[PDB]
């Protein structure tokens, strides 16, 4: 058994699978630390270092992306990971852990649960 | 069909889907189908006594 979530952006859409495991992080068949724009690598390290790497050793996560640019894909990946962990610890783990994770993750940043509702406005005659 | 608002009505495209974002969404949850929508979400005069005038 496992949990599938989705992360959204302007045009970048990602899906995320979280299941039992030894703590493997995979994005597009690759680990999280070699996404091509290296400069936002701490963004890819924002969720896990917010929680602690020892806790993630029971969950294996795999994220696939399609659409958007580089940084939009990065934001979709990190938001999808955050919502994957909170959904996994809500459905499978007791409510107190989900509540404290949600509280710390909502006092850190707003976009890590609901993405920024921004899109390009169309041109009309 | 038998609802109140359906009777009182002023009387490709089908492949569109609508997600709703609350609790996080799990695709493998058996009750996720409640959170998806197949369609788009969302004159008379008054007298002194308060009675309407119909003509």
């Amino acid at each position: 058994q496992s949990v599938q979530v989705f992360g959204r952006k302007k045009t970048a859409t990602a899906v995320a699978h979280c299941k039992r495991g030894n703590g493997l992080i995979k994005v597009n068949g690759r680990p999280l630390e070699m996404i091509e724009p290296r400069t936002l690598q701490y963004k890819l390290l924002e969720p896990v270092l917010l929680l602690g790497k020892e806790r993630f050793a029971g969950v294996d996560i795999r994220v696939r992306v399609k659409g958007g640019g580089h940084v939009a894909q990065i934001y979709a990946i990190r938001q999808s990971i955050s919502k994957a962990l909170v959904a996994y610890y809500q459905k499978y783990v007791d409510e107190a852990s989900k509540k404290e994770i949600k509280d710390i993750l909502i006092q850190y940043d707003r976009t890590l649960l609901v993405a920024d509702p921004r899109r390009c406005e169309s041109k009309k005659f | 069909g038998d609802s109140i608002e359906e009777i009182l009505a002023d009387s490709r495209q089908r492949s569109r889907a609508w997600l709703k974002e609350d609790e996080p969404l799990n695709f493998l949850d058996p009750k996720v189908a409640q959170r998806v929508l197949a369609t788009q979400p969302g004159g008379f005069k008054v007298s002194a006594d308060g009675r309407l005038i119909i003509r």
Partner: peptide
């Protein structure tokens, strides 16, 4: 009154002006 006129001339008008500028699914 006289003092009201003097103080209105001594102050600057302010207050109301509505400037009209500028998810779930």
């Amino acid at each position: 009154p006289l003092a009201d006129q003097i103080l209105a001339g001594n102050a600057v008008r302010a207050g109301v002006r509505e400037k009209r500028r500028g998810e779930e699914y």
